[PDB]
């Protein structure tokens, strides 16, 4: 979970 991460599914 790094920074700036984005949702999914």
């Given at each position: 979970?790094?920074?700036g991460?984005?949702?999914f599914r």
């Open positions: 979970r790094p920074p991460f984005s949702p």
